[model samples]
Target chain A: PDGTREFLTFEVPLNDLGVSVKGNRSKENHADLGIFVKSIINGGAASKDGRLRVNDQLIAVNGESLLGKANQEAMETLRRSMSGMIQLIVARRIS
Target chain B: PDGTREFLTFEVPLNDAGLGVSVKGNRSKEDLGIFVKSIINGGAASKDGRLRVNDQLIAVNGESLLGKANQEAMETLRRSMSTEGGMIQLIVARRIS
Candidate 1:
């Protein structure tokens, strides 16, 4: 293995947050799902906070599970949860 | 669940090519693992697709990563990656609600 295998939990607000994400499945297994941070707009909420990384994987939003969720469905959750503070459980790669 | 809980694997040349990663490790009491600090735009890792920053790397190939030190694990990662593009099997962990 390249790194640790533990899961790190934290939160960042996503109300008009400048970070974009994509929901994808593992190449070998669709059951293995992930939501990756695609980008963080410069000078945007995410960039300003400096907590969210461009490649950070999204683990949860406001305590809701995103595992095995569809892309459109994930997007809807992110878009619709823009009223106030949100929680994002991001994980670190082991390799 | 906020995302999928799975591992993904891919290879990227480390010579002149860049995977655009600034990796960090969290060995704290609550969580322990390595995460991407950054992903360079247009870099090999980013361009290759599906590789995300902060995705926990759980394993490589068939090797187990249990009980390894932070520095030791990082060494394994650096040693395995090469300019020729070493084959990597990554066990990445994510979260659910």
Candidate 2:
């Protein structure tokens, strides 16, 4: 609450958007906190871009909201962007 | 992100505030958020009376804690404890039971 919230958008080629994501969807918890970047593969597109970082929340993909989507569903949505540049909307907190 | 679940914000004094909260990250495949593993008795978290076991920590100060490793998250808390001000802000998510 005392920090600034920054929303960023990235356009990366889908062929090598080398980033792994983890979601908060579970049977016991249904919070729509969205998916987060778990790791950024070295030497990959995301790593080269350097904008995406671990713990950054993925808000949307290709203009579609990822909120409330299951882990696999979100992954599939990302995978669907196989051709051309994929657009990502991300939210990060800055100190 | 949609505001289906409310995120709670806490600003506790750093002076003599032990926080008294244990955290775990990536505990399960489904929920990768940093979670409150335990709240120590008589600690700042317990005295504040809002933090609960299993609550997910969203951010510390303004830095997002989601998807961080346990050690990294702890280090973030440690760094925030040393902030210039005598107060630290926390953002947490509580699951409805």
Candidate 3:
């Protein structure tokens, strides 16, 4: 059973998205809960953009899905966005 | 060719480890690289046994430590330390020579 989800897209500057995320997946539990936002730095790009928020689930970056990916692997995907802009797709549970 | 690189992730218990660490970097400057200057003995970082001097703290608690000043980075760390029974995650980078 899944909850109602709202998808959001953001294009922020590379190297300074100003957001941190953590994976909900655990080694003990095989459930792939997906990656979620842990924090948004003050005055940073994400903070300034005002769309991303703590606890928001990150679904994709630059068209690559982050589903079932480990925390480190997701981080690597974000870091690999060497271009000037980074596109992110986030999913938030509304209900 | 790039040097051999390693990323180490640690979840330090703030209630016990105390996250005793000193960092170096400035967000105002162009070079936003933050490195570990020193780690206190018996503190969370030192006791974790994976953190080391000169190691770059790439992320803390899932947040990227890059592009932040020393004070900002420390603030993030301080917030994590304030949480009792909480575990702070740190992702560190080191180059093997």
Candidate 4:
């Protein structure tokens, strides 16, 4: 398989965007802690829509920056959903 | 390596009692358990608590909460609230960072 440094995009439907995230530790660069995917509900939107994984950093949501934001901020951007799909920009975990 | 299984245990008062978590809805083969989506500040779940946002509710009163949805988990919490003098025991695991 061939993979590059490119990021991945997932359009999880309003009902199926099953994922959890948490803040990174202090000194990991607040922005880098942006939002780390904690879990991807197996067989759910993230899984079915494909390409997302736990520990991935969510850089943006619907084109808005999630970097350095806390729960309410990043959470709101995702929660401000009144659409059929949720747009996510995620970076692969650098492990 | 100091390897040890860390299981957080805590007792919450009835008035301040709360597991303080929410969940995302999805159908999957994997048992996601009761995924925590939120935690109430100043609540029992936040005070001297190990529970945090994204911590999975693995069991309630020694019973499995794993693989359950929002309603199911709520029901279990409700039972604990109404019975046993409102004492609640929760087993939770922090989501992998």
Candidate 5:
């Protein structure tokens, strides 16, 4: 492992907004997620693939489910996990 | 939408340890998250079940990794989004913190 490479992993939560499905979610009580897809600014990796969407709720990968998971853990997994087209599992609370 | 069903999914993790070569983390000086276990007293769930251990880790739930005290709870979510089983994603080498 390279010991000179430093990283600055911030609590970057792409999924800042959340929508409640079962109960009544008021504006002040609206719960948001930690991570989410902001805009793939690079317009290079996921840009060419058309797979990553704007509001694509990253539910899971391969066979996992992020339906009720944390953002940091999820992003960490994405950080040093894979390089190919990783599978993502998600659940959209239909509006 | 359907009325209802007779099934419910419980977020249950079945592991014990800490291993993440890709990322590094520690417990000291870490205010990540405190465990939150909704204590249910009375003859409700467990009259003989001591939840000081179980309830101690489920106090908070969400996608977080700072000012927290729950490590296993964090990995539980990573495991779900894993195609090849799952791995414990940890981090605490932010120098300043």
Candidate 6:
């Protein structure tokens, strides 16, 4: 049985990267679902351990989206409820 | 599949690869020896439709570099042109200092 978290529709990040097949060789007219990342704010839980930086983009948190949530929405959904570390996925451009 | 482009609200765009300026007349940052036809969007003289990497902006966007001749007027023009040719009402000067 898989008890993975069920993501709420509003829990989605504003950006998501869509993978394409043509980028393997020449980077042509490319557009994908880009996932925008943000750094954890100070005085928060992740700040105590000092593992993140001001510009380091947090890709994934609790297997949910972290892209474009409004301030109040993110605060209510993530700030007071999160209790553990989450996985992260990173992407870098190749030339 | 392909990867991503890390964009920062504080980073240079397409500087590592593409051309995105909405206007023209701005030239190569390299002094005297830059690729002239590397990019052409709209202009009197344009690229032959060839795409190539441009040299790093050495004079214009250089940090701590002061304008030599035509300094103040050039700076005023730069400020006016920064917003892609629209009349910019810059209430404050954006200085690093």
Candidates in order, TM-scores: namely: 0.42, 0.43, 0.45, 0.39, 0.31, 0.24
Candidate 2: residue A57 lDDT (0-100): 75
lDDT tens string, model 2, A1-95? 13333467888764536888887533332223447799999988888778888978776778876543556777777667544567788877654
* Model 1 Cα lDDT, one tens digit per residue, B1-97: 2346654544333333545677877765543666676788877666555567677766544344546777777777666555244324455665532
Tens-digit lDDT string for candidate 4 (B7-82)? 3433343444344445543346543345567777776566645556655555554455655676786677566556
After superposing candidate 1 on the true structure, give the runs of residues whose Cα lies further than 4 Å from its correct spot. Answer: A1-5, A13-16, A26-32, B1-97
Candidates in descending TM-score order: 3, 2, 1, 4, 5, 6
Superposed model 4: Cα runs more than 4 Å off: A1-6, A14-16, A27-32, A81-83, B1-97
Candidate 2 residue-wise lDDT at A86: 70
Tell me the deviation in Å of residue A4 in model 5: 45
Error of 5 at A24 (Å): 18
The TM-score of predicted model 4 comes to 0.39
Tens digit of per-residue lDDT, candidate 1, span A1-95: 12333345665554437777877544543233456788888877678678777656665577765543566676776666665465776765545
The RMSD of every model to the true structure, in order and in angstroms, is 13.2, 15.0, 14.3, 18.8, 18.4, 18.9
lDDT of 2 by residue, B4-92 (tens): 44465545543344688887765444335577889999887776666778777777645776567777776776665665434445667
Docking class of 1: incorrect
- What digit string (tens of lDDT, one per residue) describes model 5 on residues A69-95? 455566665554443345544322222
Clash number for each model:
25, 0, 1, 0, 25, 8
Listed for each candidate, the true contacts retained, as a fraction, are: 0.00, 0.00, 0.00, 0.00, 0.06, 0.00
Comparing 1 with 6 on DockQ, the higher-scoring candidate is 1
Judging by TM-score, tell me the better candidate of 2 and 6. Answer: 2
Q: What does candidate 1 score on TM?
A: 0.42
